[PDB]
Amino acid sequence: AFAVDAAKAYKDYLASGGQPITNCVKMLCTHTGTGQAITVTPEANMDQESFGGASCCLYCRCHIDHPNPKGFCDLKGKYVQIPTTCANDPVGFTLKNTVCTVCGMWKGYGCSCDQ
């Protein structure tokens, strides 16, 4: 029944005041893209930075299994758009946030489906 909980460990280390994971791979792009969360090519809008997905994934970066029966990563090989105000901790951001499954935006950072 024992399973390492890296997501909780990272969140707790963040709350404890620890420096976020660095060297996430920021891309050059136009910053006129769709603004959607996880895309096949950089899609940052004016308010976002685009990063290489694997470098923003806690499980890729820590060399630990992905928490899914299928050991699948939905960031690896894609680009993740991070609000510029959160871009100092892309890994923490992708851990703590959810993609709206109808519009593809981050809940609370672009998804207007609830208005």
């Binding site: 920021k26 050059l28 290489g52 997905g53 970066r61």
Partner: protein, 296 residues
């Protein structure tokens, strides 16, 4: 001025000289370009390389196959692979590799010395950032280096599709005469210096549209001396200007034809198509790769 280009390619007249090798002494050796906020050198460098490759007649087939050697960083990520994946058409098969472990956006990653890498298929584009810092020995003769360059020359000759292209990092001290000689087996070649790293003697040796036969005879010792002479007498102004306009960055999906032909079937009509970036010659089977593991 060339400060708005992604970089500077070695002018043809310098290729035609017969210089003797001397020490590389760059006027701008000390300086650094000012990168956009939070952008790392390796992203900027690969972006400018890809912007320059956009000006060449690269073959871009459906189901393009690209392999990237030396793709790891000492941070355990692959920023050059991330730029390549941004640049290449969606659905391009991208494989990368490095001696040291790293996490990557490539479709598949092999860890180990590049000499352990084997592939069944041929490739449309080979990128190499491999570099051994122990070559930068200013206190001995600068001779042609072997190591990974030996592998790269064989890999080009065995596993690069006709019409395919190459970009292999060299420096003043990290270079190989046979690789320069192999440049004469493409329809065109150059040594390209990124504007962001112009204070370094690094360049990318680019072979454009592989022909599988010597089109030109190139003496590799002479050519590297020619390259250093060009660098020594042509200071390149450091510049990140081209990084701010990415509107035309993606590689144009040309849908270049892929055919399987046998050596005796290569017309000069075929050689012309190859030379123009209009044909890739390889089999189109499944892509299978592997890494040799030495057991104790």
């Amino acid at each position: 001025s060339q400060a708005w280009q992604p970089g500077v390619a070695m002018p043809n007249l310098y290729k035609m000289q017969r210089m003797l090798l001397e020490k590389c002494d760059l006027q701008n050796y000390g300086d650094s370009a000012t990168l956009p906020k939070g952008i790392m050198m390796n992203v900027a460098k690969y972006t400018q390389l890809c912007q320059y490759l956009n000006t060449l007649t690269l073959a871009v087939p459906y189901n393009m196959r690209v392999i990237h050697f030396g793709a790891g960083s000492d941070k355990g990520v692959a920023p050059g692979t991330a730029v390549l994946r941004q640049w290449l058409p969606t659905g391009t098969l991208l494989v990368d590799s490095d001696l040291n472990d790293f996490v990557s956006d490539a479709d598949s990653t092999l860890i180990g010395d590049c000499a352990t890498v084997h592939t069944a298929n041929k490739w449309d584009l080979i990128i190499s950032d491999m570099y051994d810092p122990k070559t930068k020995n200013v206190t001995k003769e600068n001779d042609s280096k072997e190591g990974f360059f030996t592998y790269i020359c064989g890999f080009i000759q065995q596993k690069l599709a006709l019409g395919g292209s190459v970009a292999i990092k060299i420096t003043e001290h990290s270079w190989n005469a046979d690789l320069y000689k192999l440049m004469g087996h493409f329809a065109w070649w150059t040594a390209f210096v990124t504007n962001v790293n112009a204070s370094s003697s690094e360049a990318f040796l680019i072979g454009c549209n592989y022909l599988g036969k010597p089109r030109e005879q190139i003496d590799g010792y002479v050519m590297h001396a020619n390259y250093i002479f060009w660098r020594n007498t042509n200071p390149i102004q450091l510049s990140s200007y081209s990084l701010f306009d990415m509107s035309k960055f993606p590689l144009k999906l040309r849908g270049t034809a892929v055919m399987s032909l046998k050596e005796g079937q290569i017309n000069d009509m075929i050689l012309s198509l190859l030379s123009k970036g209009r044909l890739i010659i390889r089999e189109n089977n499944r892509v299978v790769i592997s890494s040799d593991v030495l057991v104790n």
